[PDB]
Write an enzyme that holds these catalytic residues in place. Sequence first.
Site, PDB file in Angstrom:
ATOM      1  N   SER A  98      11.232   3.501 -13.058  1.00 37.84           N
ATOM      2  CA  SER A  98      10.063   3.535 -13.936  1.00 37.84           C
ATOM      3  C   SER A  98       9.617   4.967 -14.129  1.00 37.84           C
ATOM      4  O   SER A  98       9.139   5.352 -15.180  1.00 37.84           O
ATOM      5  CB  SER A  98       8.877   2.706 -13.459  1.00 37.84           C
ATOM      6  OG  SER A  98       9.277   1.528 -12.807  1.00 37.84           O
ATOM      7  N   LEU A 138      -7.727   2.222   4.051  1.00 34.97           N
ATOM      8  CA  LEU A 138      -6.912   1.553   5.080  1.00 34.97           C
ATOM      9  C   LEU A 138      -7.178   2.118   6.441  1.00 34.97           C
ATOM     10  O   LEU A 138      -7.123   3.326   6.629  1.00 34.97           O
ATOM     11  CB  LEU A 138      -5.398   1.616   4.815  1.00 34.97           C
ATOM     12  CG  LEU A 138      -4.564   1.166   6.025  1.00 34.97           C
ATOM     13  CD1 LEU A 138      -4.725  -0.325   6.286  1.00 34.97           C
ATOM     14  CD2 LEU A 138      -3.102   1.403   5.739  1.00 34.97           C
ATOM     15  N   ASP A 147      -7.211  -6.493   4.170  1.00 35.03           N
ATOM     16  CA  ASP A 147      -6.782  -6.345   2.786  1.00 35.03           C
ATOM     17  C   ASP A 147      -5.944  -7.498   2.319  1.00 35.03           C
ATOM     18  O   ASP A 147      -5.880  -8.534   2.986  1.00 35.03           O
ATOM     19  CB  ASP A 147      -6.224  -4.951   2.393  1.00 35.03           C
ATOM     20  CG  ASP A 147      -4.859  -4.624   2.927  1.00 35.03           C
ATOM     21  OD1 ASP A 147      -4.333  -5.580   3.607  1.00 35.03           O
ATOM     22  OD2 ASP A 147      -4.284  -3.585   2.708  1.00 35.03           O
ATOM     23  N   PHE A 181      -2.733   5.692  -4.558  1.00 33.23           N
ATOM     24  CA  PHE A 181      -3.820   5.326  -3.692  1.00 33.23           C
ATOM     25  C   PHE A 181      -3.530   4.011  -3.006  1.00 33.23           C
ATOM     26  O   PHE A 181      -3.677   3.850  -1.830  1.00 33.23           O
ATOM     27  CB  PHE A 181      -5.065   5.134  -4.570  1.00 33.23           C
ATOM     28  CG  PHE A 181      -6.338   4.944  -3.747  1.00 33.23           C
ATOM     29  CD1 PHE A 181      -6.776   3.670  -3.398  1.00 33.23           C
ATOM     30  CD2 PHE A 181      -7.170   6.022  -3.438  1.00 33.23           C
ATOM     31  CE1 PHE A 181      -7.964   3.487  -2.676  1.00 33.23           C
ATOM     32  CE2 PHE A 181      -8.378   5.852  -2.762  1.00 33.23           C
ATOM     33  CZ  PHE A 181      -8.790   4.573  -2.381  1.00 33.23           C
ATOM     34  N   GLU A 213     -10.578  -1.712  -6.168  1.00 27.92           N
ATOM     35  CA  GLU A 213     -10.667  -1.952  -4.739  1.00 27.92           C
ATOM     36  C   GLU A 213     -11.913  -2.676  -4.276  1.00 27.92           C
ATOM     37  O   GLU A 213     -11.958  -3.256  -3.199  1.00 27.92           O
ATOM     38  CB  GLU A 213     -10.671  -0.594  -4.015  1.00 27.92           C
ATOM     39  CG  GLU A 213      -9.364   0.132  -4.198  1.00 27.92           C
ATOM     40  CD  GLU A 213      -8.165  -0.541  -3.571  1.00 27.92           C
ATOM     41  OE1 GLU A 213      -8.437  -1.537  -2.786  1.00 27.92           O
ATOM     42  OE2 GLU A 213      -7.033  -0.147  -3.754  1.00 27.92           O
ATOM     43  N   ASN A 266       9.905  -2.666 -16.499  1.00 24.97           N
ATOM     44  CA  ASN A 266      10.452  -2.315 -15.209  1.00 24.97           C
ATOM     45  C   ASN A 266       9.409  -2.349 -14.095  1.00 24.97           C
ATOM     46  O   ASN A 266       9.681  -2.644 -12.933  1.00 24.97           O
ATOM     47  CB  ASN A 266      11.073  -0.908 -15.301  1.00 24.97           C
ATOM     48  CG  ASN A 266      11.906  -0.548 -14.102  1.00 24.97           C
ATOM     49  OD1 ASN A 266      11.413   0.132 -13.177  1.00 24.97           O
ATOM     50  ND2 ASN A 266      13.141  -1.069 -14.064  1.00 24.97           N
TER      51      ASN A 266
END
EC number: 3.2.1.17
Length: 162
Positions: free
Chosen positions: A117, A32, A20, A104, A11, A132
């Site tokens: 998945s 966020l 972002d 996250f 990040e 996948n």
Amino acid sequence: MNIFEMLRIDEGLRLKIYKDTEGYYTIGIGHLLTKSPSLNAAKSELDKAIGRNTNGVITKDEAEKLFNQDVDAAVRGILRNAKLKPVYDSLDAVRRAALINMVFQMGETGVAGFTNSLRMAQQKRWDEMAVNLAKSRWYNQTPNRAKRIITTFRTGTWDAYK
Ligand SMILES: [Cl-]
Ligand SMILES: [Cl-]
């Protein structure tokens, strides 16, 4: 290597409000703030999150505190999620970190959405799962990061982050 270091790598860290990869107001270590296009709304959220009048800027300590809360929340969110819990429980320590990371970045709802998945993860079918996971918007929009997570799941090691 660990979850905090890993996410800090993915990040980054910014002390000023920023947009972002998706155009949303964010700050600190991937925190966020809002999806709304208004900067004011973002400023309000930030002040509300920090407990002071920030004027859109925070300190490193403040960034880190939001980060701590965020990781914790992610973990807890996974553990309370019916679809997520079982997966997480079946994995080894490195892979769990990979799942937390995805949560996250995209929310519990988003990851719970990778049904196929997830099933593969549970059956420990590593190479299939990696193929996948790649067939997703997630991978097409942030390919480098996705690649790192994918390798992590595939190998069960931190090679992608070393
Ligand atoms: Cl918050
Ligand atoms: Cl990326």
